[PDB]
């Protein structure tokens, strides 16, 4: 046989991300004396669009605590954050949209974005346009909150971990139908080259396990094991069950 398409992607080459026109990385401010004890103030200087990301970025200046200089940060704008507003950052900071706080420092029910999985990693969960995570409870022991992630699975993280108050801008972006091949073409021109996608059942047997011909059919179960080997994994991979669900 050949090396199927989904193997060739881990070598980089063609399949690397298209990064040129991006803003910087979107990261919180470093977790320091400022945010850990008091709070800090900075102006969101502009929000702005980041290529291949559908979730506008907010550029927040801060004043360097330990030297006289300005320090710019790249935050993911939270829907209602606005140019000129004052962002407050720390455990003593208030509860308001745009502010970044420790998680134990909010009451349960609070909704938050860009939330760190462990303290000071400068944010992971709910970065995408229109995402949020709700704090479902706290702990006396071991600085633990517990939160429900956008996937719906609840995960228990450190009450010292941060997150910014709100839910990311960029709204209902996926409601609008792509409507055209070209609209999906430019979608991925600025992201990575996964598009368009040729169907494995349409290839020859050399190119894909599906590629058996003479009719177009997969010919053996489309559900592959987890212990399967690189080059056999195509189709429904760990699939627990299959078919149309209708599960609300």
């Amino acid at each position: 046989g050949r090396v199927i398409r989904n193997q060739r992607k881990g070598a980089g080459s063609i399949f690397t991300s298209h990064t040129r026109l991006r803003q910087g990385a979107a990261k919180l401010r470093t977790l320091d004396y400022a945010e850990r004890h008091g709070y800090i103030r900075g102006i969101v200087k502009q929000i702005v669009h980041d290529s291949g990301r559908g979730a506008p970025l907010a550029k927040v200046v801060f004043r360097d605590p330990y030297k006289y200089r300005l320090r710019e940060e790249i935050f993911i704008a939270n829907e209602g954050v606005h140019t000129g507003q004052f962002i407050y950052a720390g455990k003593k900071a208030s509860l308001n949209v745009g502010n970044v706080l420790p998680l134990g420092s909010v009451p349960e029910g609070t909704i938050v974005s860009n939330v760190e999985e462990k303290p000071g990693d400068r944010g992971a969960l709910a970065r995408a346009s229109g995402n949020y995570v709700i704090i479902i409870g706290h702990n006396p022991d071991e600085n633990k909150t517990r939160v429900r992630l956008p996937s719906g699975a609840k995960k228990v993280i450190s009450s010292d971990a941060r997150g910014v108050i709100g839910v990311i801008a960029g709204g209902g972006r996926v409601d609008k139908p792509l409507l055209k091949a070209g609209r999906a073409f430019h979608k991925y021109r600025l992201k990575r080259n996964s598009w368009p996608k040729t169907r494995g059942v349409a290839m020859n047997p050399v190119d894909h396990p599906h590629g058996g011909g003479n009719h177009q059919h997969i010919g053996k179960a489309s559900t592959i094991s987890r212990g399967a080997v690189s080059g056999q994994k195509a189709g429904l991979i760990a699939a627990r069950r299959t078919g149309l669900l209708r599960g609300s």
Binding site: Y33, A34, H37, G38, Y39, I40, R41, R63, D64, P65, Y66, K67, Y68, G90
Partner: protein, 231 residues
């Protein structure tokens, strides 16, 4: 005075860029610096076996500097000191004076390892000085168990390099004398009996007990304030 004003800076979160402070604890140190500090701590933690931990019992500078002062009048023959005794006595005795009798019998501090051990094996020395800092530590540790069984009184001392300046060199490890001066018989057996106190006879107690432990600062105040306060 009142052409001026008193304008205190707020030096607190949100204002007034912090003043220079002593970061000497926070400094990111060169790698070699890190290890030598961290090699200590590693040896400070864990559990030291008895025969290794039998050191760190050292001689207080009181007994030390006085012991050293005894040894310090016994310095072995030096560079120019060997020019005199040789080119004179090897001349004056050449065809003339008596063989080996033309120069006086010496008294010195008798240095080197296989030197010192062979003595202690043959019971020809009285006071031994074994320095605490020797890498490898195996070059020594057998002696305190050997010096007891051979009945030679010994002293674990500071200054592997301190014992060296006594002997003219940079470093020493073992330094032990043998004969001494007929007058100094007092101090030696005064040293022997007060040095037999800490490490000679008390040594068999040092063995039974091990060493190690030392949770260190942040872990100490954690266990104290846990069990010993409230928990």
């Amino acid at each position: 005075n009142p052409l001026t004003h008193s304008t205190p800076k707020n030096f607190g979160i949100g204002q007034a860029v912090q003043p220079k402070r002593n970061l000497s604890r926070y400094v990111k140190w060169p790698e070699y610096v890190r290890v030598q500090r961290q090699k200590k701590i590693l040896s400070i933690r864990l559990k030291v076996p008895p025969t290794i931990a039998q050191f760190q019992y050292t001689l207080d500078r009181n007994t030390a500097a006085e012991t050293f002062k005894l040894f310090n009048k016994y310095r072995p023959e030096t560079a120019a000191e060997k020019k005199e005794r040789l080119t004179k006595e090897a001349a004056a005795v050449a065809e003339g004076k008596s063989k080996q009798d033309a120069s006086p019998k010496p008294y010195a501090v008798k240095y080197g390892l296989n030197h010192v051990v062979a003595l202690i094996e043959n019971k020809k020395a009285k006071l031994v000085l074994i320095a605490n800092d020797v890498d490898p530590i195996e070059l020594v540790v057998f002696l305190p168990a050997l010096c007891k069984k051979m009945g030679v009184p010994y002293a674990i001392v500071k200054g592997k390099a301190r014992l060296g300046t006594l002997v003219n060199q940079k470093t020493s490890a073992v330094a032990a004398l043998t004969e001494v001066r007929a007058e100094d018989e007092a101090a030696l057996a005064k040293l022997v009996s007060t040095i037999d106190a800490n490490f000679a006879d008390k040594y068999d107690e040092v063995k039974k007990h091990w060493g190690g432990g030392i949770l260190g600062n942040k872990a100490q105040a954690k266990m104290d304030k846990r069990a010993k306060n409230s928990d």
